[PDB]
CSV table of C-alpha atoms and ligand atoms in Angstrom, one decimal:
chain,number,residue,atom,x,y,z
A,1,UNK,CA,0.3,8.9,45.9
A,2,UNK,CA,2.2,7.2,43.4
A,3,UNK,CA,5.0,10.0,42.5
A,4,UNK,CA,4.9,11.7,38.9
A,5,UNK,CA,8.0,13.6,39.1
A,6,UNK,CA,11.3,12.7,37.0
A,7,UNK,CA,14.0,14.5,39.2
A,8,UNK,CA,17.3,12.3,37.9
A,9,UNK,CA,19.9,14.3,36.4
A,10,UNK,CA,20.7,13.9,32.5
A,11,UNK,CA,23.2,11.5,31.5
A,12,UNK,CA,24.5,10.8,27.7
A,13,UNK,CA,27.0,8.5,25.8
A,14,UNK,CA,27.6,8.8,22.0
A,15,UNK,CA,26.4,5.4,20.7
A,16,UNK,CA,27.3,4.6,16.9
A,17,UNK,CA,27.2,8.0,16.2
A,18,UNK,CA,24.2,8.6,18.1
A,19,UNK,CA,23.1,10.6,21.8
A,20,UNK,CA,21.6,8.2,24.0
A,21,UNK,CA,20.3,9.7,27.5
A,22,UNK,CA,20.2,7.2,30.7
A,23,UNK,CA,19.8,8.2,34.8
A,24,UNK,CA,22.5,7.1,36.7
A,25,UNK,CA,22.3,7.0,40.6
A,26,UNK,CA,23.5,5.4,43.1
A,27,UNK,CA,26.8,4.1,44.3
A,28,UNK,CA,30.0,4.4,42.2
A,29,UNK,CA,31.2,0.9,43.4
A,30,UNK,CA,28.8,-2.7,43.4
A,31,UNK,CA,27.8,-4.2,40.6
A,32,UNK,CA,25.3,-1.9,39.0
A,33,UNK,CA,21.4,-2.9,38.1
A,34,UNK,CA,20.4,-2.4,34.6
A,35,UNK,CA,16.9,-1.2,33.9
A,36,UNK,CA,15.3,-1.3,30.1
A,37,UNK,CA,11.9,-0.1,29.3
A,38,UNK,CA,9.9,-1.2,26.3
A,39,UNK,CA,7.7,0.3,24.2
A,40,UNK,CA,5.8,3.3,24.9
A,41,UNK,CA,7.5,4.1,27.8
A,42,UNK,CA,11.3,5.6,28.7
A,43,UNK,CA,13.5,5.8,31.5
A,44,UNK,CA,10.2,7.4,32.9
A,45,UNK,CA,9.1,4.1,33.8
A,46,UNK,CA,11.2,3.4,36.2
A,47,UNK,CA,11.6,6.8,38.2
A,48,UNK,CA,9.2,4.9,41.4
A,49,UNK,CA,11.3,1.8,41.3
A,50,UNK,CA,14.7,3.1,41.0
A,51,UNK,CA,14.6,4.9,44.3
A,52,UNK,CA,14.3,1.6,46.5
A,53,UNK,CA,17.2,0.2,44.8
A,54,UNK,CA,19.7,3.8,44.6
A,55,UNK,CA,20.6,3.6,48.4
A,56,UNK,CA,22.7,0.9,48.0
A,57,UNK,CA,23.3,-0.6,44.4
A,58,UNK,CA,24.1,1.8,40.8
A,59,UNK,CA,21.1,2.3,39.1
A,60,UNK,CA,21.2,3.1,35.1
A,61,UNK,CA,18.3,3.4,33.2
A,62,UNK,CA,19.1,4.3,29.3
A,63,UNK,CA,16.3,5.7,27.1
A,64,UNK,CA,16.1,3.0,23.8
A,65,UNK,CA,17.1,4.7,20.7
A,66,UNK,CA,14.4,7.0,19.2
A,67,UNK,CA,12.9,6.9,23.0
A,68,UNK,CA,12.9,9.3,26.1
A,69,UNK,CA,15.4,11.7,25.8
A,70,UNK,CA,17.5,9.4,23.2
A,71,UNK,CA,18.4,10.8,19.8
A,72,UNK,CA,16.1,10.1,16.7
A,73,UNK,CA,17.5,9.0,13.8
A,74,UNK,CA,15.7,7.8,10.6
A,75,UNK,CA,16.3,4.1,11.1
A,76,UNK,CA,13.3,1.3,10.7
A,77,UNK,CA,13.9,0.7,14.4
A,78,UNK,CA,13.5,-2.9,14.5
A,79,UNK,CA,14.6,-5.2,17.5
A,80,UNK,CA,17.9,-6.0,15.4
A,81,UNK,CA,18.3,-1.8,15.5
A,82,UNK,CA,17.8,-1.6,19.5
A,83,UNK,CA,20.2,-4.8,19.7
A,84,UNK,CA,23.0,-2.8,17.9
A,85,UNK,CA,22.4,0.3,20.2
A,86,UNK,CA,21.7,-1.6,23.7
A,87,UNK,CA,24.9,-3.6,22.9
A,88,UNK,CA,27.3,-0.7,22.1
A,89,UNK,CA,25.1,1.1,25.2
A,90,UNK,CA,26.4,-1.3,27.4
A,91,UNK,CA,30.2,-1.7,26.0
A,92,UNK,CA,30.6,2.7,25.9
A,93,UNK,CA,29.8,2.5,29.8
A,94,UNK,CA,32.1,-0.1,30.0
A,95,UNK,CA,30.0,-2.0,31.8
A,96,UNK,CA,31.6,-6.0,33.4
A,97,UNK,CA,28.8,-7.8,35.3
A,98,UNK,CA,25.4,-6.4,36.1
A,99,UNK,CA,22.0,-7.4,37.5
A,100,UNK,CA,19.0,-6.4,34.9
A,101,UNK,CA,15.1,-5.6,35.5
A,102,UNK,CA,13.5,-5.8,32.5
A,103,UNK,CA,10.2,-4.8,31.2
A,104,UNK,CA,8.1,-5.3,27.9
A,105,UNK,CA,10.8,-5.0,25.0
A,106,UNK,CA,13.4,-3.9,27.7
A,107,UNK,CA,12.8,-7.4,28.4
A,108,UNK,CA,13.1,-9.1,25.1
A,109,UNK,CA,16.6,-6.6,25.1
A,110,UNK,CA,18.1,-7.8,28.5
A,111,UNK,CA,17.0,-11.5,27.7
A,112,UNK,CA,18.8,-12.0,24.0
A,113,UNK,CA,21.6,-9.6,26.1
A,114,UNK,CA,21.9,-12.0,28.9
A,115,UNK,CA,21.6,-15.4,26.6
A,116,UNK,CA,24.6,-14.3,24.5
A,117,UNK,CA,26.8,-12.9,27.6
A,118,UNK,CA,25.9,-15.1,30.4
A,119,UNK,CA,28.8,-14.7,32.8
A,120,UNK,CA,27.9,-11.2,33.0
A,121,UNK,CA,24.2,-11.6,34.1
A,122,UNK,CA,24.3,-12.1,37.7
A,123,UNK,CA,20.1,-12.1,38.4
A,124,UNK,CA,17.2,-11.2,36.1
A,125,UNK,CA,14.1,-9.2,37.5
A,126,UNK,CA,11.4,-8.8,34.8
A,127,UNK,CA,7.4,-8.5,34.1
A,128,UNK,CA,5.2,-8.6,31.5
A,129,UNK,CA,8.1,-9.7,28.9
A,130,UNK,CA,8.5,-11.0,25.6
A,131,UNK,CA,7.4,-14.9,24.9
A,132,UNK,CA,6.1,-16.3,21.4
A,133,UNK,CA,2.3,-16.1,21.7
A,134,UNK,CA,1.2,-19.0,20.2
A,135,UNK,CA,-1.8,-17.9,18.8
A,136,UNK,CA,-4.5,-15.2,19.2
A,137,UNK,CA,-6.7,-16.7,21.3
A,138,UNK,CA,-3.9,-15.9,24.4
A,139,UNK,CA,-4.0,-11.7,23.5
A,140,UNK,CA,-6.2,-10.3,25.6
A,141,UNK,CA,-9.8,-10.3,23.9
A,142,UNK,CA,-10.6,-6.5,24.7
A,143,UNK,CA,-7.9,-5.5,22.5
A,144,UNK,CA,-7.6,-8.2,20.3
A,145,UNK,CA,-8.5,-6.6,16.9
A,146,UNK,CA,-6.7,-3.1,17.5
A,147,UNK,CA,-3.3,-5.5,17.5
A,148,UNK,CA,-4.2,-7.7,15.0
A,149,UNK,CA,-4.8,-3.4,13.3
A,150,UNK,CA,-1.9,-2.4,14.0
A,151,UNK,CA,0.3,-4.9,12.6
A,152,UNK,CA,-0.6,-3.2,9.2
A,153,UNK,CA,1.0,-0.9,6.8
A,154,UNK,CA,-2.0,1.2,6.5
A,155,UNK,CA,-4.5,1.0,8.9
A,156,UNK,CA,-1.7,0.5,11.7
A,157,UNK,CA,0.3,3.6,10.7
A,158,UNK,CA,-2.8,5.3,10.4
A,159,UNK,CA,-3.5,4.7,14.3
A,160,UNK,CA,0.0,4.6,15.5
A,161,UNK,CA,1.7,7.2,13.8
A,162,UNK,CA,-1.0,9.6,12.3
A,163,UNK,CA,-3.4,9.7,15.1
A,164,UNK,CA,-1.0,8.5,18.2
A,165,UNK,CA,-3.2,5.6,19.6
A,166,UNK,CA,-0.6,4.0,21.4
A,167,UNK,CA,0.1,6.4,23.6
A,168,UNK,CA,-3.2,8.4,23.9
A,169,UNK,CA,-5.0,5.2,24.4
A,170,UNK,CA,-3.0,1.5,24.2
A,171,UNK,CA,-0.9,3.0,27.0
A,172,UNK,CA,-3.2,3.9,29.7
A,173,UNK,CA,-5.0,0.5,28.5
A,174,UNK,CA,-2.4,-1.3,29.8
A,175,UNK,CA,-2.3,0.9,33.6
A,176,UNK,CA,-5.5,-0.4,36.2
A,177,UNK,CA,-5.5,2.9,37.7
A,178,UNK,CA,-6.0,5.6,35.9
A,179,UNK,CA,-2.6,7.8,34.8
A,180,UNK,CA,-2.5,11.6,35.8
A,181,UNK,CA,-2.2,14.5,33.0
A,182,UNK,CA,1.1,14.9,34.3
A,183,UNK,CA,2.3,11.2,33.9
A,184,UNK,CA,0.3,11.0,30.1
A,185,UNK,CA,2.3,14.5,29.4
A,186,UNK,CA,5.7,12.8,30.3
A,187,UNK,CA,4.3,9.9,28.0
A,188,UNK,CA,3.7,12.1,25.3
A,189,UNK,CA,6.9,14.1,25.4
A,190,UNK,CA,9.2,12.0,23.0
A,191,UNK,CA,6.5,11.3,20.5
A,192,UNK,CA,4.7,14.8,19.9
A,193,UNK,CA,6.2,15.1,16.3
A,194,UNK,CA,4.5,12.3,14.2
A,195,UNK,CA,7.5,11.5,12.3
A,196,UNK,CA,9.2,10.2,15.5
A,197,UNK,CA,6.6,7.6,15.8
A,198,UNK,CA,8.1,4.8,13.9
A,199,UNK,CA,9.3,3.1,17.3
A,200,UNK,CA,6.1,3.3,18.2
A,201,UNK,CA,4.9,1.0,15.2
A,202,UNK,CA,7.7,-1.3,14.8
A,203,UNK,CA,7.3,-2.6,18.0
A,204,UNK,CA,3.8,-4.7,18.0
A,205,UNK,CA,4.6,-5.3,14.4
A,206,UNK,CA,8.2,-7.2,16.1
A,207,UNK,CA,5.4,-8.8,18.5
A,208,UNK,CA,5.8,-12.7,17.8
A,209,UNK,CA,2.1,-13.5,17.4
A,210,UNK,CA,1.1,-16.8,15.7
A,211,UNK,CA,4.5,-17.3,14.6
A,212,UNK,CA,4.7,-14.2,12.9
A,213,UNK,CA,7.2,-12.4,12.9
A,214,UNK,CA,9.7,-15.8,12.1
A,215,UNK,CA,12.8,-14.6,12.9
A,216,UNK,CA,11.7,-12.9,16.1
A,217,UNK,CA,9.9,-15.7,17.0
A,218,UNK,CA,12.9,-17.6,16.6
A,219,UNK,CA,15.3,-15.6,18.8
A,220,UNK,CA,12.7,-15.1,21.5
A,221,UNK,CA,12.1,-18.9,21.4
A,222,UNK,CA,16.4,-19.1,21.9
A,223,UNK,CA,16.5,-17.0,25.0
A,224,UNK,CA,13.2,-18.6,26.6
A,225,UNK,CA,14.9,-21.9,25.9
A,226,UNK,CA,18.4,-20.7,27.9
A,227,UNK,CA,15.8,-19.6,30.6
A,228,UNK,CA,14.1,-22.8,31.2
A,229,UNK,CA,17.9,-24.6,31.9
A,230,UNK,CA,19.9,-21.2,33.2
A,231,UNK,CA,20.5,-21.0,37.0
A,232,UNK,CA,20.6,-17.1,36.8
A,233,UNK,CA,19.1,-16.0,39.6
A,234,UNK,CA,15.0,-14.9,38.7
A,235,UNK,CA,12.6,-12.6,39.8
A,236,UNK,CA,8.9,-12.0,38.2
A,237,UNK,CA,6.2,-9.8,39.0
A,238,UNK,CA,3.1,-10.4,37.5
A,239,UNK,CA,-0.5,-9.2,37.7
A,240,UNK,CA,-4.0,-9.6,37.3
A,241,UNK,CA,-5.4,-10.2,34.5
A,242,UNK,CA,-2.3,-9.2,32.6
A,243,UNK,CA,-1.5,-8.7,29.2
A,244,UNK,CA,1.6,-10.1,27.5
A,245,UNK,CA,1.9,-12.7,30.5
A,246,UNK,CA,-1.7,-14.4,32.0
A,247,UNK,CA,-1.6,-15.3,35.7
A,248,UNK,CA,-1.9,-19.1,34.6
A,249,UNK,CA,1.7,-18.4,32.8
A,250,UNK,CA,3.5,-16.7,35.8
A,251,UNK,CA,2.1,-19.9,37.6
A,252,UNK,CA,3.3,-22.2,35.1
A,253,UNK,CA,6.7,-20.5,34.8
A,254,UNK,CA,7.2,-20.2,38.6
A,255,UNK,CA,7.9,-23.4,38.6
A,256,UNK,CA,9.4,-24.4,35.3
A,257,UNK,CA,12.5,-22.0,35.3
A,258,UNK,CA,15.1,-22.5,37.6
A,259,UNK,CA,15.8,-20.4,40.6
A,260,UNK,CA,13.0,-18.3,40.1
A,261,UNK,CA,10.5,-16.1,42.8
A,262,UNK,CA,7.5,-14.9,41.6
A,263,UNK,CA,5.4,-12.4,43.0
A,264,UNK,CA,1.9,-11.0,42.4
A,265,UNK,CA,1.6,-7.5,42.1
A,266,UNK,CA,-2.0,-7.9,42.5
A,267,UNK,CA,-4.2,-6.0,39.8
A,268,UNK,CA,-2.3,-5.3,36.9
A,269,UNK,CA,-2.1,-5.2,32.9
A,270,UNK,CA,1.1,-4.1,31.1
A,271,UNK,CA,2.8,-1.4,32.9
A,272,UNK,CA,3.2,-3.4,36.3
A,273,UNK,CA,5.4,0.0,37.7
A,274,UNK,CA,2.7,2.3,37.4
A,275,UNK,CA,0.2,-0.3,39.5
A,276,UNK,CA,2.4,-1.5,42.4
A,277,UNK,CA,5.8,0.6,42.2
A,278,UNK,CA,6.0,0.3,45.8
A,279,UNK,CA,5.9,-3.8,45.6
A,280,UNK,CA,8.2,-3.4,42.5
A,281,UNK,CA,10.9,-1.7,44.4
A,282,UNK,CA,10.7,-2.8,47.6
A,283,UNK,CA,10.9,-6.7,46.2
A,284,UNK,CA,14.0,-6.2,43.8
A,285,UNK,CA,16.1,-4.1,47.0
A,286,UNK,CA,15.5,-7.6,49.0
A,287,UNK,CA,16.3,-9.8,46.3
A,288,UNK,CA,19.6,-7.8,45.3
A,289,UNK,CA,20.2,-8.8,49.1
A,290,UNK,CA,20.6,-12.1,48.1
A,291,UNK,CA,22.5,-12.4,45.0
A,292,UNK,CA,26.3,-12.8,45.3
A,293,UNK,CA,26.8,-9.4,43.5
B,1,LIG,C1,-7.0,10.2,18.8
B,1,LIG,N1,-7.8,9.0,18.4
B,1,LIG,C2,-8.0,8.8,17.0
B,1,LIG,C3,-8.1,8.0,19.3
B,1,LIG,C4,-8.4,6.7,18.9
B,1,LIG,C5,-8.7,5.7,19.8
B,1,LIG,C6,-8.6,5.9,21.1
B,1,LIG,C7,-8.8,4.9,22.2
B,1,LIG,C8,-8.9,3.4,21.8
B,1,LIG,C9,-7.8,2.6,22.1
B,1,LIG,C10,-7.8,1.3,21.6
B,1,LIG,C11,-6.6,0.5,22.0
B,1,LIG,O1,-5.6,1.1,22.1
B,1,LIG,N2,-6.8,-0.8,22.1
B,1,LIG,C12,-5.7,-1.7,22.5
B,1,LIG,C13,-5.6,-1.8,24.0
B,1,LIG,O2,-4.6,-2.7,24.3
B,1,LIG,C14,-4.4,-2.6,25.8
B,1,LIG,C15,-3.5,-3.7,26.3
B,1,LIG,O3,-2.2,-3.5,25.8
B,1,LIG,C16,-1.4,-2.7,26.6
B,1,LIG,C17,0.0,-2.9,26.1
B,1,LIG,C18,0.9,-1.8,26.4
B,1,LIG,C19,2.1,-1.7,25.4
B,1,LIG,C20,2.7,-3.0,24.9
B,1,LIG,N3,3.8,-2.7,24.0
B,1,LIG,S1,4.2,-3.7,22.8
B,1,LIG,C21,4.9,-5.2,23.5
B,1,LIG,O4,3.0,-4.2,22.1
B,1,LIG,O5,5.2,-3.1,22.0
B,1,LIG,C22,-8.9,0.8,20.8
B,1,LIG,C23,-10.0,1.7,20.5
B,1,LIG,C24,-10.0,2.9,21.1
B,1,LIG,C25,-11.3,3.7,20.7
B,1,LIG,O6,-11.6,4.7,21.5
B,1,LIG,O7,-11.7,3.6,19.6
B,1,LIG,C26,-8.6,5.2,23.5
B,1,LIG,C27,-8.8,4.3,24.5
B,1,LIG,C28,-8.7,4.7,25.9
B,1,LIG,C29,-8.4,6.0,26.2
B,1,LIG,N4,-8.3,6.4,27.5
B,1,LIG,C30,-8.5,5.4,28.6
B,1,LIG,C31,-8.0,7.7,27.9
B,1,LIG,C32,-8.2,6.9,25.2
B,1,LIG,C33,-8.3,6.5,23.9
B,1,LIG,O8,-8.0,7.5,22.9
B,1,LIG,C34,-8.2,7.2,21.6
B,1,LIG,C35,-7.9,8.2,20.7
């Protein structure tokens, strides 16, 4: 079955002032493939996918700040706060040109990454990423009011941080098959002090919904516009029925963004890798083939 384990060895890099864990496999030389996860989810996402790609390309996969096995500091930890850290992140490995797969936030991380350095993005893999949703009528209806809840001071926290809804429940709501103990205990491990939850709420209140927030809404709107004209190279898996990305968008942007593969991962929601790791994997090791990396 799908594999539960989490057998890379710890990494870490002092960040501003902070301990930020990532894996790192794979071969010293190449260009190396960047992976970011988004919100709930770590490093830990990736442990299936990472292994089709080791055997011939570097592999790093950093836990966000106040994620995974990444230090916790008391910060807000908006998008602009991950920005900070992913940049320095990058610049303390000393990383030149890299290939990213993307996921979720991850993805809303590599894209505002790659539209501000884009002689060092030499493809883009990603899934079920950050777009402006233009209104509430595109959010999935079965979970519809528990986002529109959460994006609250008081109810929200209530659910998010008090009571740990979105991991106990938003998480495996966004998984077709059902998650082992194991795999909801590797979930739960970052987040079993309450207090380290803010992550957990700041990210769907970042969720640009409606036009709201405006200023994420606005730099998501400047990468998506750099994606429609960039010739990066583009890969995207998507699922059935979804949840940030509908089939009928994968279709649409399929064929509006340039030099891009899509492939269906058949049923799906949010986290794609825990549905069809072995399609995941398998796809971005041929597509690496290809690039001129
Ligand atoms: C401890 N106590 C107070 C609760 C409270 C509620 C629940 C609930 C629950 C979930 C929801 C709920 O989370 N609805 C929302 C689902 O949304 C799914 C699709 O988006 C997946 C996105 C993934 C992350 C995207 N990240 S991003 C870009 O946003 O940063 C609503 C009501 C209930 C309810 O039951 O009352 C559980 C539901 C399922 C479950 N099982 C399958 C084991 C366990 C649940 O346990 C719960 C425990």
């Amino acid at each position: 079955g799908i594999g539960t384990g989490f057998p890379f060895d710890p990494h870490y890099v002092e960040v501003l002032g902070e301990r930020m864990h990532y894996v790192d496999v794979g071969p010293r030389d190449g260009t190396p493939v960047l992976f970011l996860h988004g919100n709930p989810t770590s490093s830990y996402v990736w442990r299936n996918i990472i292994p089709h790609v080791a055997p011939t390309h570097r592999c790093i996969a950093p836990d966000l700040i106040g994620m995974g096995k990444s230090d916790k500091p008391d910060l807000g930890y908006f998008f602009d706060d991950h920005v900070r850290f992913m940049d320095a992140f990058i610049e303390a490995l000393g990383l030149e040109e890299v290939v990213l797969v993307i996921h979720d936030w991850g993805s809303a991380l590599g894209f505002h990454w790659a539209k501000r350095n884009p002689e060092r993005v030499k493809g883009i893999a990603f899934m079920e990423f950050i777009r402006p949703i233009p209104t509430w009528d595109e959010w999935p209806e079965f979970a519809r009011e528990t986002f529109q809840a959460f994006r609250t001071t008081d109810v929200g926290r209530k659910l998010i941080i008090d009571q740990n809804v979105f991991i106990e429940g938003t998480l495996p709501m966004g998984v077709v098959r059902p998650l082992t103990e194991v795999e909801m205990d590797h979930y739960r491990e970052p987040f079993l002090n309450p207090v380290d939850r803010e992550p957990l709420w700041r990210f769907p209140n970042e969720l640009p919904i409606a036009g709201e927030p405006a200023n994420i809404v606005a730099l998501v709107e400047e990468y998506m516009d750099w994606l429609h004209q960039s010739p990066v190279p583009k890969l995207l898996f998507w699922g059935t029925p979804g949840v940030l990305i509908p089939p009928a968008e994968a279709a649409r942007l399929a064929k509006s963004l340039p030099n891009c593969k899509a492939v269906d991962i058949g049923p799906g929601l949010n986290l794609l890798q825990e549905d069809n790791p072995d399609l995941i994997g398998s796809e971005i090791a041929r597509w690496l083939s290809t690039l001129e990396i």
